[PDB]
Design a protein around this ligand. Structure first.
Ligand SMILES: Oc1nc(-c2ccc(C(F)(F)F)cc2)nc2c1CSCC2
Length: 351
């Protein structure tokens, strides 16, 4: 039965559930699709690989022998078979190598979730309607000329800096999203002070799982050292910072970005990386202090939530490894997803 969903909603389902995009990502990661096809991927496979990366991180830091490190590296590549052609598999003997593999396993996890979702379940109704229902998310189109659309376009326009200006962002569609059960889950944290409407950028191959299971934290098996501020949910107050996580190109210039209401409370303000396991007593989030911050005078309050749509101005900071701020929560319930944007990247050089 022909779908009654708006074309921009239909086209979003087609995007996030594309199997060719999924396989394209695995190939980019240099995974052997003969030994490890899409359907062979398991949660237990990725969790076991995470455990080996933590074993590697421990081995390196506890002064293990090169043979022990190589054996561990070989175990990883046995579990997630890669195809390097003439090249040899990169030795997982340093922290950078494990951060690369942790990032990959993060992205593979959502690909497993998308494909398992897509292949699972049940006829006589459009497969787009079937797949919209699987997301357990109400996806509404926000009108181009609405007040909220004007606020979101101002947020994108003003929070787009010159350092990242190797592209221009063009907002194609704005979706008002609400995941089944997320409001009730967030209610205890709706109480907390310092709630902000922040950005979360991710690969398009990650949004089926993001809409289905929400924004998650890396599992306990994952190395805490494989993430800058530990295993939490990362956000940005400047669209350009998050837009760099959209993994777009000349070939595919369309990305997906999120606007989430994040209950931050007391922020553990830091200038340099910290591998947070447990947050300090009295703190509810981390604020990675950046050199540039949106103008605090220009802050707006859409639905009681602070929208830091201020134009990029310099902050006090001074001794920091961050150009732009970042916010991190360590409870998946501290996030309430509000909007999903479909962005066009108009790539061009600028000096
Ligand atoms: O907006 C952002 N998104 C992500 C982000 C992208 C992909 C993934 C995943 F590993 F693929 F699940 C996780 C987090 N990270 C950051 C920011 C803005 S603050 C800097 C870090």
């Amino acid at each position: 039965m022909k779908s009654k969903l708006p074309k921009p909603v239909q086209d979003l389902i087609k995007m996030i559930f594309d199997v060719e995009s999924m396989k394209k990502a695995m190939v980019e990661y240099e995974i052997d699709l003969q030994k490890m096809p899409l359907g062979k991927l398991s949660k237990r496979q990725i969790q076991a690989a995470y455990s080996i990366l933590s074993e590697v991180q421990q081995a390196v830091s506890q002064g293990s022998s090169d043979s022990q490190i190589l054996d561990l590296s070989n175990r990883f590549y046995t579990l997630i078979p890669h195809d390097f052609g003439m090249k040899k598999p990169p030795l997982l003997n340093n922290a950078d190598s494990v951060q690369a593999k942790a990032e990959m396993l993060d992205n593979l996890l959502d690909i497993e979730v998308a494909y398992s979702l897509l292949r699972g379940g049940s006829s006589s109704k459009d497969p787009i309607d079937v797949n919209y229902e699987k997301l357990k998310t109400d996806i509404k189109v926000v009108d181009r000329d609405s007040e909220e659309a004007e606020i979101i376009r101002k947020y994108v326009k003003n929070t787009h800096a010159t350092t990242h200006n190797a592209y221009d962002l063009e907002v194609i569609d704005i979706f008002k999203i609400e995941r089944e059960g997320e409001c009730q889950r967030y209610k205890p944290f709706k109480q907390l002070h310092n709630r902000r409407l922040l950005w979360h950028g991710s690969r398009t191959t990650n949004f089926a799982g993001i809409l289905s299971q929400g924004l998650r934290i890396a599992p306990p098996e994952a190395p805490v050292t494989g993430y800058m501020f530990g295993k939490g949910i990362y956000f940005a107050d400047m669209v350009s910072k998050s837009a760099n996580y959209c993994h777009t190109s000349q070939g595919d210039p369309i990305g997906l970005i999120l606007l989430g209401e994040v209950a931050l409370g007391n922020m553990y303000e830091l200038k340099h990386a910290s591998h947070i396991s447990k947050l300090p007593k009295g703190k509810h989030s981390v604020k990675g202090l950046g050199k540039t911050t949106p103008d605090p005078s220009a802050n707006i309050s859409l639905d009681g939530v602070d929208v830091p749509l201020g134009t990029g101005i310099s902050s006090g900071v001074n001794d920091t490894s961050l150009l732009y701020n970042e916010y991190i929560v360590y409870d998946i319930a501290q996030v309430n997803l509000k909007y999903l944007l479909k962005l066009k990247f108009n790539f061009k050089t600028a000096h």
